[PDB]
Amino acid sequence: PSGIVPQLQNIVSTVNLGCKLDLKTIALRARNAEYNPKRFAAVIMRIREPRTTALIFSSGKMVCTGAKSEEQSRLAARKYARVVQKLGFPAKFLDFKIQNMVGSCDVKFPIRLEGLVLTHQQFSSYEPELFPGLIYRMIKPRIVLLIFVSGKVVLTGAKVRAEIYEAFENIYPILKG
Amino acid sequence: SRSQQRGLRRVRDLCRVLQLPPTFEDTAVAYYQQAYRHSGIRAARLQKKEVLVGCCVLITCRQHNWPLTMGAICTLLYADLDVFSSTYMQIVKLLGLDVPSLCLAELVKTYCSSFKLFQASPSVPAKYVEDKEKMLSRTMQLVELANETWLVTGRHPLPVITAATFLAWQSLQPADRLSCSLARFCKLANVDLPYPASSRLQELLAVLLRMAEQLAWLRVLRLDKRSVVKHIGDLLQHRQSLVRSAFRDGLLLPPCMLKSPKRICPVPPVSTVTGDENISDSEIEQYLRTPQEVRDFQRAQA
DNA sequence: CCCGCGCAGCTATATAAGGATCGCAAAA
DNA sequence: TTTGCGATCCTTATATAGCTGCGCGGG
Numbered sequence: 363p364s365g366i367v368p369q370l371q372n373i374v375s376t377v378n379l380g381c382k383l384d385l386k387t388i389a390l391r392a393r394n395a396e397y398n399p400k401r402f403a404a405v406i407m408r409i410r411e412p413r414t415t416a417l418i419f420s421s422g423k424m425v426c427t428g429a430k431s432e433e434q435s436r437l438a439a440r441k442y443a444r445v446v447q448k449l450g451f452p453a454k455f456l457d458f459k460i461q462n463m464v465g466s467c468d469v470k471f472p473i474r475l476e477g478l479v480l481t482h483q484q485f486s487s488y489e490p491e492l493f494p495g496l497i498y499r500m501i502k503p504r505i506v507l508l509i510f511v512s513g514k515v516v517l518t519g520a521k522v523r524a525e526i527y528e529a530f531e532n533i534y535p536i537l538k539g
Numbered sequence: 540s541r542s543q544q545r546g547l548r549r550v551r552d553l554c555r556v557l558q559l560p561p562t563f564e565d566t567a568v569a570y571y572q573q574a575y576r577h578s579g580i581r582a583a584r585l586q587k588k589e590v591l592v593g594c595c596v597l598i599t600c601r602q603h604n605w606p607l608t609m610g611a612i613c614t615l616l617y618a619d620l621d622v623f624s625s626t627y628m629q630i631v632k633l634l635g636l637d638v639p640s641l642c643l644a645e646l647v648k649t650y651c652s653s654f655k656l657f658q659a660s661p662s663v664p665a666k667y668v669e670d671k672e673k674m675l676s677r678t679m680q681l682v683e684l685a686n687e688t689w690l691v692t693g694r695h696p697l698p699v700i701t702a703a704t705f706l707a708w709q710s711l712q713p714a715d716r717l718s719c720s721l722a723r724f725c726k727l728a729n730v731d732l733p734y735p736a737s738s739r740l741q742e743l744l745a746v747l748l749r750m751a752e753q754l755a756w757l758r759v760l761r762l763d764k765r766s767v768v769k770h771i772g773d774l775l776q777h778r779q780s781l782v783r784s785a786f787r788d789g790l791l792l793p794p795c796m797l798k799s800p801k802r803i804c805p806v807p808p809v810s811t812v813t814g815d816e817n818i819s820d821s822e823i824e825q826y827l828r829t830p831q832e833v834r835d836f837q838r839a840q841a
Numbered sequence: 842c843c844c845g846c847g848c849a850g851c852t853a854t855a856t857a858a859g860g861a862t863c864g865c866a867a868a869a
Numbered sequence: 870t871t872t873g874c875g876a877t878c879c880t881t882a883t884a885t886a887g888c889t890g891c892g893c894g895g896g
Contacts, residue, residue, distance in 0.1 A: 369805050372856040374883050391833060394826045402853045403887060409826065412812070415854055417885060425885050427855035430807050436814030444823045462883035466804070466857045472793050475692050476640065483637050491609045491641065492624045493880045494693030494859045506881050508858060511692045511793040516857050518882040540892080582848045582891055621879065628880090693859065720871095734862055737872095795859060804857090 364534040368465035368517055368526050372428055373435040376461055379422040379443055380454035388418060391449050407442055414438040418446065422453075432460050432523065465517040465526035469537055473513055482536065498533070505529035509537070542588055543575050549592045556615065557607070563599050570595040570634070577633055583626075590616065590623045594630050601638050606646035608697060643682060643696060650700050651678050654728040656708065662727050666715040669708055677707035680775045681743065687782055688746045689793040695735060701725065702739035710771035717768060742794055749791065750774050750781040 388405050389397035395418075396406040405418040412434040417425040424442060429435035439458060446453040475496045479488040488496040495516075498507040503525040508516040515533065520526045550571050554564040574580045574591060583591075593612040600607040609627070613620045631638055651674060659665050681703035685691050691699055705724050709716045721740055725732040744764040751757040751767055751774060760766070767774075774781060785791050828836070 369857090372882095374855070376884050390836060391828055392826055393828050393832075398852095400852095404853070404885070406854070417854055419885055421886075423885055425854065425883085427883090429855090431810050431812060433812045433814040434810060437812055437816065437818075440814070441818055441823070444818050445826050448823055448827060459884090461885095462855095464856050464882070468804075472689060472796060479640070487628070487631070488640070489628075490691075490693050490860090491695055492628070494861095495880070497881065499881095508881060510795075510858055511689065512796050512859075514858055516881075518857085520882085542892085578848060578892090581893080582850095584849075584890060587849085588891095624879075695861075698861095735860080 363531065364469075366467055366469065366530070366534070368467045368515075368530045370430055370463060370465050370523065370526065372462075372464040373426075373430070373432055373460060374462035375426045375429070375432075375435040375439055375459060377424050377426065377439050377443065377458045378454075378456040379418075379424060379446060379451070380456045381422045381452050383418065383420050383422055383446065383451055385418070385420050388446065388449055392445060394445075407445070409438060409441050409445075412438045416442040418442070432463075435460060460521060462518065463520040463523065463526060465520070465530070467515040467517070467530055469513040469515065469534065471513045471537075473509060473511055473537055475509065475511060478509065478536075500529050500532065502532075503528050507533055509533075513537070540575070542585070543572075546571055546575070546588055546592055549589070550595060553592055553596050553615070557596070559596075559600070559605065560603075563596075563603065563605070566602075567595045567599040570598055570630075573634055574630055579629070579633065586618075586622060587626050590618050590626045591630065592616065593618065593623060594627045597627065598631070598636065598638055601641065604639070604642040604645050606642055606649045608641065608646070610695075610697070641696060643686070643691075643700075644679065646696065647679050647682050647700055647703075648675060650697065651675050651704050654704060654708075654730055656728050666712065667719070667727065669711055673711055674704070674707055677711065677771075677775065678704050680778065681706055681771075684746065684775070684778055684782070685739070685743055688791055690739065690742050690746065692793060693795075694739070695733070698733040698735035698739050701730070701733055701736040702743055704728075705736075705740065706743060706768070706771065709768050713769040717765065744768075746791075747771060747774055749785050750778075753781050753784040753788075 385397055385399070385405050389395045392407065394408050403419070407416045407418055408414070412429050414426055414428040426435055426439045426442065429438055436458060440455060443453050443455050475488050478496055479486040482498070485499050486496055495508040495510045498509055500507060504519060505517055505525055506519045507529060515530070517526050517529050547568055550567050551564055554567060571591065574595065580591065593616050597607055597609065597612055609623060610620065613623050652671065656663060656667060656669050657671050659668050678700070682700055685699050685703060702721070705721050708724065709719070721737060722732055741764070744767060747767050748762060748764070751762050751770065757770060762770070
């Protein structure tokens with residue numbers, strides 16, 4: 363192994379509260395809700411612990427972002443559901459699912475991206491006129507990696523923690539050699 | 540399709556405006572046609588169909604090492620670079636193409652030759668006039684040095700060449716050109732000054748100062764970003780030897796690495812959360828407005 | 842000459858990375 | 870003038886969703 367463990371930065375999860383919601387009521391009666399229907403059609407709600415952001419839609423569907431663990435994402439999602447319930451809606455906690463996970467790493471050595479896009483062209487996209495990182499589209503596991511000249515790596519597109527660790531253990535010998 | 544025929548006409552007009560060789564037009568027309576077969580392209584906005592014209596011409600140019608920049612295409616097409624970015628990435632992915640990278644050697648020749656410093660004029664005094672071949676040869680050596688010393692990777696390429704052209708020009712007559720700034724130089728050479736060109740200049744001067752430290756007779760002179768300029772000729776004569784020697788000792792790394800202050804990134808503490816713990820009523824009630832807060836808000840919106 | 846369909850993407854949320862490019866304010 | 874610093878945008882993933890642009894089929 364590399365001896366390097368990628369750190370989870372963000373978890374995106376979803377949940378169906380199983381009932382239709384009046385967003386005007388949520389915005390008026392909650393302290394932590396932000397609602398500008400002309401700008402964006404959902405309520406933006408925030409809680410302090412776990413420090414996250416939820417988008418609540420009039421359909422009853424909800425998106426939870428910003429958590430650092432899959433456990434924190436579930437606890438935060440349940441807290442938003444409990445806030446909505448106390449506001450007078452018959453909210454349920456249905457079909458909770460982790461949709462995306464973002465991890466980050468540092469290999470602590472510089473990377474010649476101009477060389478990596480030649481040896482691994484079938485997975486690599488590097489256009490420095492557009493973005494400083496090399497976009498690596500790994501097939502197994504299906505993960506997108508943003509590789510920078512600094513040796514710092516961003517891993518995204520994972521449904522489970524293991525896919526982040528697997529993708530990093532796969533990229534490490536490619537970056538070292 | 541009326542939008543396809545209009546697109547193919549625009550592709551041909553762009554190639555003629557750019558004065559591209561005759562074979563390029565056909566290849567770019569064929570890429571636009573190949574693109575139109577996909578439903579994702581057919582369903583796109585008329586703005587995306589306008590930048591698609593440019594994507595197809597750029598791919599053709601990239602394959603023939605024609606040094607066309609994405610910024611130059613967007614300027615000619617009066618297009619947004621962000622709209623061009625997303626369309627180019629989509630069409631490369633869609634047509635499953637291995638598009639070669641921009642050829643820096645060819646861009647140095649084209650861009651450097653546009654610098655109007657080869658003839659004297661009221662705005663270009665005699666002491667500022669330089670030989671085109673001496674300029675190209677030294678600019679190229681400074682662009683290769685920037686590439687070898689990690690100043691090009693992940694950065695826009697044109698500001699690197701602007702900074703290398705200015706340093707080549709100054710180093711060819713140091714006594715009379717050191718008073719001239721990068722901004723004054725771009726103005727008289729009649730070239731736009733790219734915003735990152737000042738940062739690239741300073742990074743390139745810092746790289747030449749590290750090389751100067753490898754030569755005992757230059758190390759003892761305690762050179763600075765101003766006094767190093769008259770020795771650039773001597774440093775480039777031995778660039779291969781000095782670069783190997785500089786990497787061998789210590790430290791020569793991408794500027795974004797040296798240095799980052801926040802050495803520890805896992806600032807959030809390790810959690811013992813299970814996601815199943817009880818959620819008390821007091822924990823939730825803090826996120827609810829009181830009947831008074833509600834009345835005061837309602838009255839304020841009435 | 843309309844209607845429906847299937848895309849496209851606009852608004853927005855989070856997060857890491859590094860670069861570009863503003864505004865703004867302070868030593869030169 | 871000339872610098873430095875900080876804020877806000879770009880990229881990736883991912884769901885949520887109405888409105889709307891765009892062209893292809895049927896009718």
